Design a protein around this motif. Structure first.
Motif, mmCIF file in Angstrom:
data_model
loop_
_atom_site.group_PDB
_atom_site.id
_atom_site.type_symbol
_atom_site.label_atom_id
_atom_site.label_comp_id
_atom_site.label_asym_id
_atom_site.label_seq_id
_atom_site.Cartn_x
_atom_site.Cartn_y
_atom_site.Cartn_z
ATOM 1 N N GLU B 1 0.800 -1.204 0.060
ATOM 2 C CA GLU B 1 0.115 0.062 -0.006
ATOM 3 C C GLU B 1 0.894 1.359 -0.011
ATOM 4 N N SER B 2 0.545 2.245 -0.768
ATOM 5 C CA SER B 2 1.221 3.620 -0.945
ATOM 6 C C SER B 2 1.144 4.361 0.362
ATOM 7 N N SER B 6 -2.631 4.801 2.284
ATOM 8 C CA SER B 6 -2.720 4.341 3.804
ATOM 9 C C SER B 6 -3.498 5.705 4.457
ATOM 10 N N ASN B 7 -2.830 6.883 4.294
ATOM 11 C CA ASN B 7 -3.481 8.139 4.762
ATOM 12 C C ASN B 7 -4.689 8.268 4.383
ATOM 13 N N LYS B 8 -5.128 7.952 3.053
ATOM 14 C CA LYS B 8 -6.741 8.333 2.889
ATOM 15 C C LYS B 8 -7.520 7.283 3.402
ATOM 16 N N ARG B 9 -7.046 6.050 3.458
ATOM 17 C CA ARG B 9 -8.101 4.970 4.199
ATOM 18 C C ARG B 9 -8.232 5.401 5.436
#
Ligand SMILES: [Cl-]
Lengths: 9, 9
Positions: B1-2, B6-9
């Motif tokens: 995962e980029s 990760s941050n958007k999720r």
């Protein structure tokens, strides 16, 4: 899954 | 995962 996400993926 | 994804999720 959203259409938006499917288009991004 | 980029890190960005990760941050958007
Ligand atoms: Cl996005």
């Amino acid at each position: 899954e959203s259409q938006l996400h499917s288009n991004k993926r």
